């Protein structure tokens, strides 16, 4: 569920996924957190443990919210 984003990240590069799909490679977590602030998104350590770790370009809290709403609505 929860997922580190932004400047928690460690790793020092990273394969980067953009919000639309596209592969954008393996980039530096420098060059990455560029990308994802021009596009005023986050970037997302979406697989972890993953060589190199995959991030992914998206909006952190409108993905958190849907995820829980999701979790809510499907058990009341
Ligand atoms: C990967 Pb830079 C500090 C325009
Ligand atoms: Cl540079
Ligand atoms: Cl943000």
Not at 20 to 25: S, T, V
Not at 29 to 34: D, N, P
Not at 62 to 70: A, L, M, S, T, V
């Amino acid at each position: 569920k929860d997922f580190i984003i932004n400047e928690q990240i460690r790793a020092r590069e990273v394969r980067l996924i953009d919000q639309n799909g596209d592969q954008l490679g393996i980039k530096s977590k420098q060059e990455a957190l560029e990308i994802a602030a021009r596009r005023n998104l986050d970037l997302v350590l979406v697989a972890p443990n993953a060589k190199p770790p995959v991030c992914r370009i998206m909006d952190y809290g409108k993905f958190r919210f849907e995820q829980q709403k999701k979790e809510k609505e499907a058990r009341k």
